[PDB]
Design a protein around this ligand. Structure first.
Ligand SMILES: NC(=O)C1=CN([C@@H]2O[C@H](COP(=O)(O)OP(=O)(O)OC[C@H]3O[C@@H](n4cnc5c(N)ncnc54)[C@H](OP(=O)(O)O)[C@@H]3O)[C@@H](O)[C@H]2O)C=CC1
Ligand SMILES: NC(=O)C1=CN([C@@H]2O[C@H](COP(=O)(O)OP(=O)(O)OC[C@H]3O[C@@H](n4cnc5c(N)ncnc54)[C@H](OP(=O)(O)O)[C@@H]3O)[C@@H](O)[C@H]2O)C=CC1
Lengths: 329, 323
C-alpha cells in the first residue's frame, strides 16, 4: 500500500486525511509517477472545500515531480518519448498528494538534469500559468507596466521575474514587509499595500504610471482587489482575473468595462492553454529555458511532510506562505 | 433661430420636444455645421431614456453631415461639406462639432450616405481592426445583421476575407444581410445552448473567433456560448436592453474568453486616430468594398416617430433625419 491524502467529505483543511491506499495503475495514455516532490496550489483548496465540485472520495492535487515507475499499457508507450526511470513533472496529475500517482504523458515534461525535483514541483503548474498569462492572455512587450497582486506568492514571484526579464515594469501588492523585500528582489519596481479603496489605490498606480494606468493587471486575489484592478487600467488594457484567493469576484456590470477605458476582462484557466501535447511542451520548454538562463529563479518557499498537507493548506489560506510550497513524501 | 429636438426630462420617445433655439456660435476649435442630413443612432435613445446620464436639458444626437457655416478661432473652411460623429446637439438645423473629429465628405458621397456611414462606420472600423483584429479565414457572429452597424460590419468583414454569421428578425432583413455578404443568417436565439450548438455546427465544432453583439440583454448568453476557445465577445451595444452583471467565472467556463465593452470615445482619442479610421472608411466606400445604403428618412420634426421605429425593430439599415 502507499500513503495518500484523501478527501471523503469536502470542508476545511481538517478533511485532508493521511491514509493507506492501493498503489494506482496507469491507464491508457498515462504514466505512473513515484513522487519525489508534490506541488501545493491554491486550487487544491477549492477542490478540498467543494467550491470546485468533484466526485467523492478523491485523492487531492495535480502537481507532482518524480520518477516514471511504469507506463500505461496498450498504445501509450508508442505515443511518448518518456520512459520508465525518467524524472518527470506534471501539473495535470490525478491524485498527486500520494507516494504514487498517474498523469497523462502528453501533459508531463521531462525534468532537466540540473533541476531538482523540489524546484520542478515548485515551478511547473505556476510557471506554465505565468507563461500563458505573459505570452498569450496579454502578450507583454518591453516598455509596458503591469500590476501583479500577491507579488510574493507562487505565481506572483514567477510573473514578476519573467515580466522584468522581458523589459516590463512590475508593480505588486503584498501583505508584509518580508514579502515586500522578496517582491523587490524578484524585480518589482514598486510594491504597494492592498487596496482599501479602489479609487485611492488606482490613484497610486496612476501616480506611478503618469496617469496612464497599467497595460495589464494580473489579479489572482479576486474579491478584495478586483475593483482596484479594474480602476488601475490604461485605455483598452487587459484585466486578467486568474484567481480568487480572497474569495470570488461578484458579477460585473459589463458597462464597468466601458467606463474603465473600453478594457478587456478575461478569466483564464490553465486547461485552455494546455490543449495539446504540442502546446504543453512549448510552454514547458520556454519555462525551463527561462529557469536555466536565470531569467527566472524558482525558489522552494516552504516544505511540508506529505502527511502535513493539512498544515500547508492552513498556512496557504492564512496568507502565511511565501513563494511555491511543496509536500515531501 | 433654428428648429431643434430637445429633451427636458428623460423617458420614452414621447419626451422628445420641438424647440426653437438661437443658432449656436462655434467655440474654440469647433465648426458650426448647417445640417443636410442628421444621423440616427441607438445611443441617442440611451441618452433620451436616461440610461446614459447627461445634464438636462439638452439637444439629442451627435452625428451630422452638412456645410461649415462658421469656424471657431484656432484644412476645413467655411463652405466645406463635412461630417462628424462627435457633434453637440445634432438633431437641429445647425450644430457644433470639434474640427479634429470632423471629416471632409468625399465629393461623390451624398450627405445622407455620409450621415448614414460615419458614426457606425468608425465603429465597424474599430471593432474589426482594433477590438478584435479579424483575419482572413476567421468566422464571426454579428447580431442585428440588417441594422446600421451590422450591415457595415458584415460587408467590411466579408471584404477582409472573414466569414460572417448574422441574426435578424425578419425575412426582408435576412435578404439584406445575405446581400451584405453574410454566409449564414439565423433567427435570434431562443435557447442559448441550442443557438450555440448551431453556431458550432457551422464552424466545424470550433465556435466563432469573435462575436460583435450590439443587442445586449436578449443575445448575450448565446453570444458567450458560441465563442471559440480564447475568443472575444465584443459587447458594443444594448438595443434589447442592458446586459445583467456577468459572473467572471462564466468567461472561464466559456473557454477562457475575453469580454470587452468598447465605446467609440476610446477609439477617437486624437485627431490623428480619427483621421486614420475615417480615411479607411471612405477608402472602403470609394472602392465599393462596402456600400452604405440610406435605409430610411424622417423629417427632423418627426424624431419621435424615428425613435419609435428604432425601438420597435422596424428600421432597416442606417436611417437619417432631414431638415
Ligand atoms: N487560472 C489558472 O490557470 C491558475 C490560477 N491560479 C490562481 O492564482 C493565484 C495564485 O496561486 P498560488 O501561487 O498557488 O497561491 P499564492 O502562493 O499566490 O498564495 C495566495 C496569496 O494571495 C494573497 N492573498 C490575498 N488575500 C488573501 C486571502 N484572503 N486569503 C489567502 N491569500 C490571500 C496572499 O499573499 P499576500 O500576503 O500578498 O496577501 C497569498 O500568499 C491563486 O488564486 C490561484 O487560485 C493558480 C494557478 C493556475
Ligand atoms: N462605440 C460603440 O460602442 C457603439 C455602439 N453602438 C451600438 O450598436 C448597436 C447598433 O446600433 P445602430 O446601428 O444605431 O442600431 P441598429 O440599426 O442596429 O438597430 C438596432 C437593431 O437591433 C435589433 N434588435 C434586436 N432586439 C431588439 C430589441 N429588443 N429592441 C430593439 N432592437 C432590437 C433590431 O433589428 P432586428 O430586426 O435584427 O432585431 C434593431 O434594428 C446599438 O445597440 C448601439 O447602441 C452603436 C454605435 C457605436
Amino acid at each position: 500500500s502507499m500513503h495518500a491524502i484523501e478527501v471523503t467529505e469536502t470542508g476545511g483543511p481538517g478533511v485532508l486525511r493521511h491514509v493507506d491506499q492501493p498503489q494506482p495503475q496507469p491507464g491508457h495514455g498515462e504514466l505512473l509517477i513515484k513522487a519525489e516532490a508534490i506541488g501545493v496550489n491554491f486550487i487544491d483548496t477549492y477542490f478540498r472545500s467543494g467550491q470546485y465540485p468533484r466526485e467523492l472520495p478523491f485523492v487531492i492535487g495535480s502537481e507532482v515531480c518524480g520518477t516514471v515507475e511504469a507506463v500505461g499499457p496498450g498504445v501509450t508507450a508508442a505515443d511518448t518519448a518518456i520512459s520508465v526511470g525518467d524524472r518527470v513533472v506534471s501539473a495535470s496529475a490525478n491524485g498527486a498528494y500520494a507516494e504514487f500517482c498517474t498523469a497523462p504523458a502528453s501533459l508531463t515534461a521531462k525534468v532537466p538534469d540540473d533541476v531538482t525535483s523540489e524546484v520542478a514541483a515548485s515551478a511547473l503548474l505556476k510557471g506554465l500559468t505565468a507563461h500563458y498569462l505573459l505570452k498569450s492572455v496579454y502578450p507583454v512587450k518591453r516598455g509596458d507596466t503591469v500590476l501583479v497582486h500577491a507579488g510574493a506568492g507562487g505565481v506572483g514571484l514567477i510573473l514578476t521575474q519573467w515580466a522584468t526579464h522581458l523589459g516590463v515594469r512590475v508593480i505588486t501588492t503584498v501583505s508584509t514587509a518580508e514579502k515586500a523585500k522578496l517582491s523587490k528582489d524578484a524585480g518589482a519596481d514598486v510594491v504597494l499595500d492592498y487596496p482599501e479603496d479602489a479609487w485611492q489605490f488606482a490613484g497610486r498606480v496612476r501616480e506611478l504610471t503618469g496617469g496612464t494606468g497599467v497595460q495589464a493587471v494580473y489579479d489572482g486575489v479576486g474579491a478584495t482587489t478586483f475593483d482596484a484592478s479594474l480602476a488601475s487600467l490604461a485605455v483598452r488594457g487587459t484585466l486578467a482575473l486568474f484567481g480568487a484567493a480572497s474569495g470570488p469576484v461578484p458579477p460585473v456590470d459589463p458597462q464597468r468595462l466601458n467606463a474603465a477605458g473600453s478594457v478587456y476582462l478575461t478569466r483564464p484557466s490553465l486547461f485552455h492553454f494546455t490543449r495539446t501535447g504540442e502546446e504543453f511542451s512549448w510552454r514547458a520548454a520556454e519555462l525551463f529555458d527561462a529557469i536555466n538562463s536565470e531569467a527566472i529563479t524558482v525558489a522552494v518557499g516552504g516544505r511540508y511532510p506529505l502527511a502535513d498537507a493539512l498544515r500547508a493548506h492552513q498556512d496557504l489560506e492564512a496568507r502565511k506562505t511565501v513563494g511555491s510550497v511543496v509536500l515531501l513524501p
